[PDB]
Design a protein around this ligand. Structure first.
Ligand SMILES: *[C@@H]1O[C@H](CO)[C@@H](O)[C@H](O)[C@H]1NC(C)=O
Lengths: 49, 49
């Protein structure tokens, strides 16, 4: 937004490894960076096991 | 292409070295990131401020 890359986060227990926890989330901002560069694509970066 | 300056302690003032620093301010339709802190005051309670 307006040049800022923002990251919000939260942690919730998992009943199913392959699915989501139920109930409402309410994530809070941690990172807000004034870069001025657009994102059109997202790639998850994985670590190798 | 390059030629050195004879910066000697015996030169008159016009030929003495001067350190030049230019602070250029870039104001774009982008987030601002270099701000003055302005001056602070102390907190006053129970008065109109
Ligand atoms: C972001 O989009 C704007 C609007 O078209 C464009 O001027 C700018 O070059 C883009 N920046 C990047 C890093 O793609």
């Amino acid at each position: 937004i307006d040049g800022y890359f923002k990251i919000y986060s939260k942690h919730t227990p998992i009943n199913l490894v392959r699915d989501l926890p139920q109930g409402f989330s309410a994530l809070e901002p941690l990172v807000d960076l004034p870069i001025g560069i657009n994102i059109t694509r997202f790639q998850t970066l994985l670590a190798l096991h | 292409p390059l030629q050195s300056y004879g910066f000697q302690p015996t030169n008159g003032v016009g030929y003495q070295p001067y350190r030049v620093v230019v602070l250029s301010f870039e104001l774009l339709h982008a987030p601002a990131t270099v701000c003055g802190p302005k001056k602070s005051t102390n907190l006053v309670k129970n008065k109109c401020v």
